[PDB]
Amino acid sequence: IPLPPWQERTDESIETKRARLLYESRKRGMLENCILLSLFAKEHLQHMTEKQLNLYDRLINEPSNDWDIYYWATEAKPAPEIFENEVMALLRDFAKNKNKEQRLRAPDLEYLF
Amino acid sequence: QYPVVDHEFDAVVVGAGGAGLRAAFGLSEAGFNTACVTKLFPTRSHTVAAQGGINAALGNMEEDNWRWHFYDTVKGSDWLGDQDAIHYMTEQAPAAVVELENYGMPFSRTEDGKIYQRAFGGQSLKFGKGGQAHRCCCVADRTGHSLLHTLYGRSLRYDTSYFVEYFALDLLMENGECRGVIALCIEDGSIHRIRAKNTVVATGGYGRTYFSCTSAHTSTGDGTAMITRAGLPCQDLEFVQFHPTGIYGAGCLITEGCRGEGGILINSQGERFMERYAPVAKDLASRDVVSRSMTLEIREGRGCGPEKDHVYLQLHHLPPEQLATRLPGISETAMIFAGVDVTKEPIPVLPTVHYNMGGIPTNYKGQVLRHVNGQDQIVPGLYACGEAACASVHGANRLGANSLLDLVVFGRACALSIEESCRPGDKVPPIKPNAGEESVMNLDKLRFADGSIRTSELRLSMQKSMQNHAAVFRVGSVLQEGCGKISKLYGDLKHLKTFDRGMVWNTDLVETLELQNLMLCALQTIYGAEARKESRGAHAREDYKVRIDEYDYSKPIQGQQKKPFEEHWRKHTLSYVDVGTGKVTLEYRPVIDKTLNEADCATVPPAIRSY
Ligand SMILES: *Cc1cc2c(cc1C)nc1c(=O)[nH]c(=O)nc-1n2C[C@H](O)[C@H](O)[C@H](O)COP(=O)(O)OP(=O)(O)OC[C@H]1O[C@@H](n2cnc3c(N)ncnc32)[C@H](O)[C@@H]1O
Numbered sequence: 184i185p186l187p188p189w190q191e192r193t194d195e196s197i198e199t200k201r202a203r204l205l206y207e208s209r210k211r212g213m214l215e216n217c218i219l220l221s222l223f224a225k226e227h228l229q230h231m232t233e234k235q236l237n238l239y240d241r242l243i244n245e246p247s248n249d250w251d252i253y254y255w256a257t258e259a260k261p262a263p264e265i266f267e268n269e270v271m272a273l274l275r276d277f278a279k280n281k282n283k284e285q286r287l288r289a290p291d292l293e294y295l296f
Numbered sequence: 297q298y299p300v301v302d303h304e305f306d307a308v309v310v311g312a313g314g315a316g317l318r319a320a321f322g323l324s325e326a327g328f329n330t331a332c333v334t335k336l337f338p339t340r341s342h343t344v345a346a347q348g349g350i351n352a353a354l355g356n357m358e359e360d361n362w363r364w365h366f367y368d369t370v371k372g373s374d375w376l377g378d379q380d381a382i383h384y385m386t387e388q389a390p391a392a393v394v395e396l397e398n399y400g401m402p403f404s405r406t407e408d409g410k411i412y413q414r415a416f417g418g419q420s421l422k423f424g425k426g427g428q429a430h431r432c433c434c435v436a437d438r439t440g441h442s443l444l445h446t447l448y449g450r451s452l453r454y455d456t457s458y459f460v461e462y463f464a465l466d467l468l469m470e471n472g473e474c475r476g477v478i479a480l481c482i483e484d485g486s487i488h489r490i491r492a493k494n495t496v497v498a499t500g501g502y503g504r505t506y507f508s509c510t511s512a513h514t515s516t517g518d519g520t521a522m523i524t525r526a527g528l529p530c531q532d533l534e535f536v537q538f539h540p541t542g543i544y545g546a547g548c549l550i551t552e553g554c555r556g557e558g559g560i561l562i563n564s565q566g567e568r569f570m571e572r573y574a575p576v577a578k579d580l581a582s583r584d585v586v587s588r589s590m591t592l593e594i595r596e597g598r599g600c601g602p603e604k605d606h607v608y609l610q611l612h613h614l615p616p617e618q619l620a621t622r623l624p625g626i627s628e629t630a631m632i633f634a635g636v637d638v639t640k641e642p643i644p645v646l647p648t649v650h651y652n653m654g655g656i657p658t659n660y661k662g663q664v665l666r667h668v669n670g671q672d673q674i675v676p677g678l679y680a681c682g683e684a685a686c687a688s689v690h691g692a693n694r695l696g697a698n699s700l701l702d703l704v705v706f707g708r709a710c711a712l713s714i715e716e717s718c719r720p721g722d723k724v725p726p727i728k729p730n731a732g733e734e735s736v737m738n739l740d741k742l743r744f745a746d747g748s749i750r751t752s753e754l755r756l757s758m759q760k761s762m763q764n765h766a767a768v769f770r771v772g773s774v775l776q777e778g779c780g781k782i783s784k785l786y787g788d789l790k791h792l793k794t795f796d797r798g799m800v801w802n803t804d805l806v807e808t809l810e811l812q813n814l815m816l817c818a819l820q821t822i823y824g825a826e827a828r829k830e831s832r833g834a835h836a837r838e839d840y841k842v843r844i845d846e847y848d849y850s851k852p853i854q855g856q857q858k859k860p861f862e863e864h865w866r867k868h869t870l871s872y873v874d875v876g877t878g879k880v881t882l883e884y885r886p887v888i889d890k891t892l893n894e895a896d897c898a899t900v901p902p903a904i905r906s907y
Pocket residue numbers: 310311312313314315316333334335336337338340341342343344345346347348349350440462463464465498499500501510511512518519549650651681682683684696697698699700701703
């Protein structure tokens with residue numbers, strides 16, 4: 184059963200970290216996390232500090248089951264204490280759409296250039 | 297301009313889904329130096345989305361026989377599926393499940409310690425005479441993840457070399473034999489040739505050829521495009537299975553339990569139209585009846601929304617306690633993706649692509665096939681399993697809980713055939729020094745593209761045209777116009793414009809490679825659907841509403857003249873694409889009706905499709 188214990192990467196630059204976390208946010212197992220994380224990365228990745236990027240890295244890459252991440256963001260199941268932080272709060276805030284945005288299709292990558 | 301790193305293995309497995317992990321773990325346990333290429337982390341494969349179960353006639357509930365599962369699968373395939381593969385899958389189903397349990401899958405058990413089995417719709421007993429069957433073995437609601445977690449964990453125990461986040465570009469073919477795969481390292485941008493004596497392609501489906509599919513944006517038919525670029529045939533790509541209730545726009549899957557708990561389908565006039573198309577089963581009819589009914593409501597003018605292109609799934613007539621307890625997660629899904637409060641608003645729903653029965657043609661051993669002068673021939677060193685392969689155990693329509701079974705049975709079958717025909721440490725076949733240069737040239741052109749059409753714009757036009765021409769409603773003039781549009785979109789691939797010019801996590805370049813793969817899958821799908829002038833399984837045409845077999849199975853067989861192969865349609869479609877000109881070529885090969893052994897399992901002759 185034991186899988187590789189997730190490690191916090193500290194060898195890549197901040198631009199490489201954002202690019203890696205953008206790929207790992209858009210390419211998910213389920214369509215639910217594909218739409219949410221890609222739209223959440225569109226609004227937050229380019230503005231996050233390295234502290235927030237490292238928390239966002241652990242949030243979307245450490246859990247083995249994509250459904251666990253989805254149930255934490257929708258508050259259907261309690262997130263672990265190691266994940267209850269500021270980025271999880273922003274993800275819960277983003278999941279509960281308040282400005283009534285699209286949440287239909289993954290955002291086109293034309294917003295980066 | 298591009299250094300090429302080379303790797304040598306006994307076997308390479310492209311894909312870390314259920315099928316790829318089973319083949320990679322099987323090859324490593326057999327003692328082969330096995331590489332596993334994957335553009336994702338293995339638990340991020342679409343298999344993780346499977347929350348149902350796996351079919352197997354274990355008999356831990358009632359008395360069951362795997363030959364009854366065989367009959368149900370053959371009948372569900374509308375007699376387009378190969379009965380030798382269906383025989384192998386259903387017979388190996390109990391041993392595979394017990395093998396998965398002994399591997400460490402927490403299958404939900406009963407009071408007496410036996411694996412619990414549920415009743416997925418479509419399973420019967422006594423060769424369809426009567427009695428619902430309990431064959432769906434599930435691990436709570438995380439069966440797909442538990443499968444990925446167990447197989448990936450056991451594969452690491454046998455030193456399976458994993459190339460995580462690598463994008464396979466093409467097969468390394470030489471003189472009609474596969475000698476590995478050339479892939480792109482997404483992190484740094486280096487080209488890697490992973491050489492091997494056998495290659496197993498398990499890259500999933502291609503649901504992203506349409507605008508509305510229930511799969512992630514990763515199901516891009518990459519393995520299908522590699523086989524196409526290799527000049528090898530693809531099979532039955534027009535047979536795209538639709539789920540009736542998917543959220544309009546996003547494509548998220550709405551479970552049939554909503555209609556089971558009391559949900560109804562409503563048109564733009566408040567009518568519960570399923571009362572008309574199926575007075576017996578109503579909104580709980582067969583998925584094909586429900587999907588064609590919904591599409592017919594939208595066509596005739598009763599579509600909902602500002603564009604009148606979908607219908608309503610109403611749940612607000614149910615009490616809120618039933619909406620919360622009996623239907624967990626439906627309220628969060630509808631609110632987050634559709635902005636709908638199910639207690640007072642309906643859910644916009646539309647038929648949504650769910651599964652691809654077509655893909656890479658193989659035999660029941662997983663060996664990829666090609667068609668040379670009207671004859672089937674094995675491609676040496678090339679295997680395929682899973683949703684990317686066409687065994688075909690599903691034929692014209694896939695049954696529920698049979699996909700995860702297709703993954704573990706034929707992923708194991710690929711490993712068995714490689715270890716029974718080769719040995720670890722055999723001579724790695726050599727390749728030309730410039731092998732894969734065409735793949736690197738295509739990669740460099742997409743990186744340095746600056747045309748008039750953006751990658752996202754071309755992808756949207758393709759998905760829209762596929763949605764409006766080759767979806768549930770299929771008729772001659774619409775299909776032919778769609779073929780011209782998709783062919784025009786394939787010619788427009790020479791007008792692409794990308795922005796990320798580097799090689800550090802170039803997601804823009806990865807998605808443009810996937811667009812090339814989508815266009816190849818879309819061309820073969822829509823041309824095969826236009827040519828197939830009949831109705832079978834998931835393929836239903838209005839100009840040809842009858843299943844065309846070699847005999848008319850609504851009447852006694854003997855006493856009729858058997859139609860020749862070139863006149864009936866009970867035959868697999870074989871599609872080729874000239875990558876340079878986009879020209880599609882169609883051939884056909886017969887459906888295998890013989891089983892692995894008639895003494896152990898009898899061939900089920902065709903019969904008229906009973907809904
Ligand atoms: C979409 C879906 C399917 C599904 C389901 C629910 C959803 C939302 N529920 C199911 C259920 O309850 N029961 C069942 O029997 N089936 C169910 N399905 C269908 C079935 O589970 C899937 O079809 C099946 O899991 C697919 O398996 P497969 O292993 O063949 O496909 P995959 O899991 O998507 O894995 C593909 C792998 O290939 C890698 N890949 C793809 N392209 C590349 C390239 N170019 N280079 C390298 N690797 C590549 C992917 O990364 C992945 O690992």
